[PDB]
């Protein structure tokens, strides 16, 4: 598809179509010689909606822990505001002259700019949302680099008991993300990589129990196989992090 999520597509795609039909309509002389109705009331409704978005956007930037969001979202506010100015002008030009041909240029540019700005705000927020998932994924990656430290059965029980909630969180975040995506191969890869991580969890635990049991008396194979499981589980999480960041 064109947009990588179901939400972004549903918001932008219908307006993209309408703007496109309008460009064609002009070229075909469909609106030639016709008086345009007063657009100051609908333009006010666009102004009001744009302001509300910018407010919510500004509020999100003020309270976010994400430094990348704080940086990348504010330019979209300027873009959506400036395009709205163009639309105010185009409506004023059509008020002064309902038969204005120059006015149709700021009407299209204004409409595309608002839509382009809204697109930029959505993509920027989607990136932040993806970074919440990678945070949890990078957390499970670091938790796995601790598997070599566990040399006691008392340690193994604690390591296992505390891995469950983060693993279920990651699995939940992946299952919810997967359902939103429009590129079907991306979903396949995430579902498969998460399923692999899930089937390898019991395998990893047993592998460690072996290393702890073989640490007592008479080890290298127990070390190697546990490492293989960590290496393979970590490889799949790194693949989830890679796939999560794909937008085309």
């Amino acid at each position: 598809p064109v947009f990588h999520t179901r939400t972004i597509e549903s918001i932008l795609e219908p307006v993209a179509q309408q703007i496109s039909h309008l460009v064609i309509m002009h070229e075909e002389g469909e609106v030639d010689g016709k008086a345009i109705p007063d657009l100051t009331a609908p333009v006010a409704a666009v102004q009001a909606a744009v302001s509300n978005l910018v407010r919510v956007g500004k509020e999100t930037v003020q309270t976010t822990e994400d430094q990348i969001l704080k940086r990348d979202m504010p330019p979209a506010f300027i873009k959506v505001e400036n395009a709205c100015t163009k639309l105010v002008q185009a409506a004023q030009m059509l008020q002064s002259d309902p038969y204005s041909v120059p006015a149709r240029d700021y009407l299209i540019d204004g409409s595309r700019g608002i839509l382009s700005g809204t697109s930029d705000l959505l993509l920027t927020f989607d990136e932040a949302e993806v970074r919440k998932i990678i945070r949890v994924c990078k957390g499970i990656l670091e938790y796995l680099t601790v598997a070599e430290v566990v040399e006691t059965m008392e340690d193994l029980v604690t390591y296992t008991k505390n891995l469950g909630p983060g693993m279920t969180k990651m699995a939940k975040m992946i299952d919810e993300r997967q359902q939103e995506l429009t590129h079907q191969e991306h979903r396949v890869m995430l579902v498969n990589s998460m399923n692999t991580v899930k089937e390898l969890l019991p395998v990893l635990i047993s592998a460690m129990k072996i290393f702890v049991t073989t640490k007592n008396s008479k080890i290298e194979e127990a070390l190697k196989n546990r490492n293989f499981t960590v290496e393979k589980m970590s490889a799949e999480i790194n693949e989830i992090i890679r796939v999560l960041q794909l937008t085309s």
């Binding site: 918001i11 219908p14 307006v15 609908p42 409409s111 938790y143 279920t168 969180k169």
Partner: protein
């Protein structure tokens, strides 16, 4: 009374419980119970839909009845009615 050799070594050696809690804390590796968890995304999406609707109204008001557009889906309405009916029957409403 502690052994000074073993104490010096193991004192700033983080136990598994401390190492794990630091990772769980830093990566937020626990269930979030809050209902405000989805609010920020919902608000942004609600406002983005308001802009969409406002712009579509304006573009419809400009285009008028000169617009070639026709979007009447009777088939997807039929499927959705049949889906809802069966779901109602199986739910025993």
């Amino acid at each position: 009374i502690v052994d000074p050799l073993s104490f010096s070594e193991e004192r700033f050696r983080p136990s598994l419980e401390e190492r794990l809690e630091s990772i769980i804390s830093g990566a937020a590796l626990m269930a979030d119970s809050s209902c405000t968890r989805d609010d920020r995304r919902e608000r942004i999406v609600a406002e983005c839909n308001a802009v969409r609707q406002a712009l579509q109204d304006l573009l419809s008001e400009y285009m008028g009845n000169a617009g070639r557009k026709e979007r009447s889906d009777a088939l997807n309405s039929a499927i959705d009615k049949m889906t809802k009916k069966t779901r109602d029957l199986r739910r025993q409403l």
